[PDB]
Write a protein that binds this ligand. Structure first.
Ligand SMILES: *[C@@H](O)[C@@H]1CCC(=O)N(C)CCCC[C@H](NC(=O)c2cc(C)on2)C(=O)N[C@@H](Cc2ccc(F)cc2)C(=O)N1
Length: 182
């Protein structure tokens, strides 16, 4: 793609993504609004992180859980930094759904901002991700790689999830829902 789906993704990368460095490596971070960023929980961000290489204090953080206490693999961080992210909450769905023809927007661990077409996405339920129960997964059939974590799953005008894992054949994102941020 070089048309609208790719273009919406590149704009999303430029305005609402960042590279988050923790002790566990580099992750694509999604800026949701103001100083709030999401990252995969397994990034294990501490009291300080790097945001695009800049040491940055985390004012607060919290992990998300489903109704039975199962991790969603999303962590919300509020960052001590001057820059504010453009508010993309209106692009986040209200409800779980399936989505045809999705892309992933990748920044961390890539030589340049990268957009991948992962194809059709389904709401898959709970999985075991490195042995740990994880809820509200979105599944796609694409051979994702180790550096894709935090990558933003999207369609035009829809910010759907963040990449959390895979097995070489299937890829999984944590679902983003508007109520998490509102
Ligand atoms: C990013 O940090 C990384 C992305 C890896 C990836 O996309 N890929 C193909 C590498 C293989 C990783 C092996 C794990 N996969 C699974 O467990 C799995 C389950 C199913 C149904 O399909 N695959 C995996 O993805 N692990 C992630 C780290 C993690 C650790 C603990 C958790 F609770 C959650 C995630 C991972 O390596 N993601």
């Amino acid at each position: 793609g070089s048309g609208p789906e790719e273009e919406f993704g590149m704009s999303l990368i430029k305005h609402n993504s960042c590279v988050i460095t923790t002790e566990n490596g580099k992750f694509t971070g999604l800026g949701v609004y103001d100083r709030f960023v999401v990252v995969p929980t397994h990034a294990d961000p501490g009291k300080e992180i790097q945001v695009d290489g800049i040491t940055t204090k985390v004012i607060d953080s919290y992990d998300l859980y489903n109704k039975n206490g199962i991790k969603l693999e999303i962590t919300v961080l509020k960052l001590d930094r001057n820059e504010k992210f453009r508010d993309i909450r209106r692009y986040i769905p209200n409800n779980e759904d399936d989505y045809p023809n999705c892309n992933l927007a990748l920044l961390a661990n890539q030589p340049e901002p990268t957009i991948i077409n992962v194809g059709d996405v389904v709401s898959y339920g709970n999985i075991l991700l490195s042995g740990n129960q994880t809820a509200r997964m979105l599944k796609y059939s694409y051979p994702t790689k180790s550096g894709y974590c935090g990558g933003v799953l999207y369609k035009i005008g829809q910010v759907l999830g963040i990449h959390v894992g895979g097995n070489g054949r299937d890829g999984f994102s944590a679902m983003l829902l508007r109520s998490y941020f509102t």
